[PDB]
């Protein structure tokens, strides 16, 4: 909704798309670049197979 008003008549369901019915969204910040606040070490994104 363009404005924060929702009583009964607002249509929050997105028509003609239906993608949101299975995948929600990812609005998160990316993974933290360091898991130690003081000392910097390199970790990797590794493959599974």
């Amino acid at each position: 909704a363009s404005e924060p008003i929702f009583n009964t008549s607002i249509n929050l369901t997105p028509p003609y798309d239906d993608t949101s019915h299975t995948v929600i969204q990812n609005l998160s910040m990316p993974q933290m670049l360091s898991f130690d606040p003081y000392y910097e070490s390199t970790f990797y994104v590794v493959s599974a197979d």
């Binding site: 909704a1 404005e3 008003i5």
Partner: protein, 49 residues
């Protein structure tokens, strides 16, 4: 850039409240896969609060 045109406060108190205290922040979003013939969302528009 936070202007709400004070004249509005003399004609529409409720609209001024909604515009002043609940900012909208519109954005566009989509998904992308590599080897799928499925059709997913590409340029949907939402409003984050």
């Amino acid at each position: 850039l936070a202007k709400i045109d004070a004249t509005l406060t003399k004609v529409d108190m409720n609209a001024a409240y909604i515009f002043a205290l609940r900012p909208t922040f519109p954005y566009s979003y989509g998904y992308k896969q590599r080897f799928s013939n499925r059709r997913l969302t590409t340029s949907a528009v939402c409003y984050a609060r």
